[PDB]
Amino acid sequence: HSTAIFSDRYKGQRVLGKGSFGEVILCKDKITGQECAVKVISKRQVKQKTDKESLLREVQLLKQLDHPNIMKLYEFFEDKGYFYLVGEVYTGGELFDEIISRKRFSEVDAARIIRQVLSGITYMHKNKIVHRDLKPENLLLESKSKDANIRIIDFGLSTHFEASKKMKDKIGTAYYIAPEVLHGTYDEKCDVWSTGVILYILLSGCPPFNGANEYDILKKVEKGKYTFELPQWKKVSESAKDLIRKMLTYVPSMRISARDALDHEWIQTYTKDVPSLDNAILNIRQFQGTQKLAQAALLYMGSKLTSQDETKELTAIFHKMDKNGDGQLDRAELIEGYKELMRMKGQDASMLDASAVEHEVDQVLDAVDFDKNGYIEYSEFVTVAMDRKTLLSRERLERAFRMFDSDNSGKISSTELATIFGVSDVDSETWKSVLSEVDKNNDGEVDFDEFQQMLLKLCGN
Numbered sequence: 001h002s003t004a005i006f007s008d009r010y011k012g013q014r015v016l017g018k019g020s021f022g023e024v025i026l027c028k029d030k031i032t033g034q035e036c037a038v039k040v041i042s043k044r045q046v047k048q049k050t051d052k053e054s055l056l057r058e059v060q061l062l063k064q065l066d067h068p069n070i071m072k073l074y075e076f077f078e079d080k081g082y083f084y085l086v087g088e089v090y091t092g093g094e095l096f097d098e099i100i101s102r103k104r105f106s107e108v109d110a111a112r113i114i115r116q117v118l119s120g121i122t123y124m125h126k127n128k129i130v131h132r133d134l135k136p137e138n139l140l141l142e143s144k145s146k147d148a149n150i151r152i153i154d155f156g157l158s159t160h161f162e163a164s165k166k167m168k169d170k171i172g173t174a175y176y177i178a179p180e181v182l183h184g185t186y187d188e189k190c191d192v193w194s195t196g197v198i199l200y201i202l203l204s205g206c207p208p209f210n211g212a213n214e215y216d217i218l219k220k221v222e223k224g225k226y227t228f229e230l231p232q233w234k235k236v237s238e239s240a241k242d243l244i245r246k247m248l249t250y251v252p253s254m255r256i257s258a259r260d261a262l263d264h265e266w267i268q269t270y271t272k273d274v275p276s277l278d279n280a281i282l283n284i285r286q287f288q289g290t291q292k293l294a295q296a297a298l299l300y301m302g303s304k305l306t307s308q309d310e311t312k313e314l315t316a317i318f319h320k321m322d323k324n325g326d327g328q329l330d331r332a333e334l335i336e337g338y339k340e341l342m343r344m345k346g347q348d349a350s351m352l353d354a355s356a357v358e359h360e361v362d363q364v365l366d367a368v369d370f371d372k373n374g375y376i377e378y379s380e381f382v383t384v385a386m387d388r389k390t391l392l393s394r395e396r397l398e399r400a401f402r403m404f405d406s407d408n409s410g411k412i413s414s415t416e417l418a419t420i421f422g423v424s425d426v427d428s429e430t431w432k433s434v435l436s437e438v439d440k441n442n443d444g445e446v447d448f449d450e451f452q453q454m455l456l457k458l459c460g461n
């Protein structure tokens, strides 16, 4: 029997997004039609921490585990360059994106969410699997239904793969990490700490450990001190504060277990009178919008650098291929050159096999406006393959800007820039410098186009 090839069984439909350790692609079984979400981990870009057999055994165990609040794993594939982890697709998106879209949110809603998280974590810990990187974006809703169950993603991965050091991969990690993880000695209790921070945020909309940039946040976490002095804590039950305290207990051996947290009075009472936590929802909407804009700004700048890189690479490849020196290539040649560009850049999970490349080239060749067959001008192909991506990138940045601009003022204040660039970990003096060069009127605010220009100048343009 043959070692099984991922693309012999699955075809890619669309990219779902970048997650921790790699892109996730919506795929479909070629025989049965079953849709699945495939996390593809690039061996070049993600180092392993364990030996192959340690990884294999963990995969085999994960395939046997089943819990309603844990992502289901079906299959695992490995080739020369990649690991392919095939799991169930969930369509309800990230929890915090659902929450900001409601008018009411109470401790009852929070308790129901936390109970699910604790139930998942408890099961995973019984089986000796630790998350380590638990955060709001690892909490997916199963479907778009109002009542939908939460599915936790990424259990087991941090044990086997090294985290990215790149800030586009790191936004938001610092708030949630347990202090003991920072110093190196940690166990499954780190996941209770993370859950405690999530709960604190659900009930007030502010992180318990906060600060102006990543390192400032880590400094607060490492000291471990936090308060309930914010006004919005006055609407909150004492039993919720007690559970939080126990979850954010500094010494792990004295911190409550996941299982014990399920039996806590707060969970028992509030999942079995209650105002809406309106101020919390407001603060969550603002926190989420700020996080998503910082992320969008990082992705935009990274996409601009990737485009400078790939544009020149792709031109050199076609120039080499163009044996007539006449600037003309056929479809097969554009395909082979676009393939060679993948034979190095292992960024594009969605170009999974030759068929997906064929399709993408054809979108551009269709897109070559009007079509002459045989003599494609490769310089114009490069422009449109890359302008497509550039246009897409600009539109994604803009969506995030608009969502952040909740008053529809059209502008972001310099106070708000400071918050965004802090979260993006862009140097204060450096963005102020680029703001001076763009804002020569001391308006102390920027419109979208001005913001986009600042980003271009912060990535060498």
Ligand SMILES: CC(C)(O)Cn1nc(-c2ccc3nc(OC4CC4)ccc3c2)c2c(N)ncnc21
Pocket: 016, 017, 018, 019, 020, 024, 037, 038, 039, 062, 071, 073, 085, 086, 087, 088, 089, 090, 091, 137, 140, 153, 154, 155, 156, 157
């Ligand atoms: C935006 C996104 C990156 O969270 C997208 N995303 N990420 C995942 C996701 C997340 C993690 C996944 N982990 C897997 O295996 C690891 C061994 C456990 C396998 C598939 C995984 C998929 C996901 C999903 N399943 N359904 C829907 N959206 C999903």
